[PDB]
């Protein structure tokens, strides 16, 4: 599977993976921002895993900071999601996305590193 | 030992405590913002523990917030110094410290804790 920097010709797709995501999620656990304005947020990011022609999975982070009144600002970020077709789970296409988005962070100095997919911090 | 939130009137006392801190800092692995700005900075705690009328330890620590441009701050903070005189530790003298920092701190929501006395964190 091909890893690349999303674009504006899948915000299609993602609306319908998005959906599959939130979709299983109410359904294990039952008990926001636009994909396409978090898209083109400059401090957004978001890479999918293209096989054939078509996204089989995704994932999605943004870089923060840890704001004081007694120090310069900290670069962090965080993780939020990551979805894989229930087809192509168990391949490792996860690890080639978390691969992919560690890349940027950690060429982007990040200190801190905050996943919310699915508590794990870095 | 008394533990209490530091006053304008240890500031003289403080000048030297953190004087021996950074001290025995330089002694160990020889290899910023005032401590009365920050005392009297709103965002800013500093506890001392006082065993007869002397100051005989301090703990240092800053509210801080990770902001992002596609969610609302999040409320964290940061346990920066904490300094024992050579004849008060072992004692627990640095729990008591480290137990009223957290005590603030849990009342006021904070969901990560950075602690840079000495790299862990909460």
């Known amino acids: 599977p091909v890893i690349r920097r999303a674009k504006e010709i899948d915000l299609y797709c993602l609306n319908s993976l998005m959906y ?4 299983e999620h109410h359904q294990q656990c039952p008990d926001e921002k636009s994909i396409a304005r978090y898209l083109d ?4 990011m978001v890479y999918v895993a293209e096989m054939d022609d078509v ?10 900071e840890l704001i004081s009144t007694v120090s310069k600002l900290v670069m962090m970020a965080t993780i939020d999601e990551l979805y ?22 950690k060429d982007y100095g990040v200190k ?3 996943v919310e997919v699915w508590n794990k911090g870095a």
């Open 41 to 44: 947020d400059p401090e957004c």
């Open 55 to 64: 996204i089989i999975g995704f994932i999605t982070g943004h870089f923060c």
């Open 84 to 105: 894989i077709e229930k087809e192509y789970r168990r391949e490792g296409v996860a690890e080639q996305l978390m691969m992919r988005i560690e890349q940027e962070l």
């Open 112 to 114: 801190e590193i905050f």
């Open 20 to 23: 599959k995501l939130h979709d």
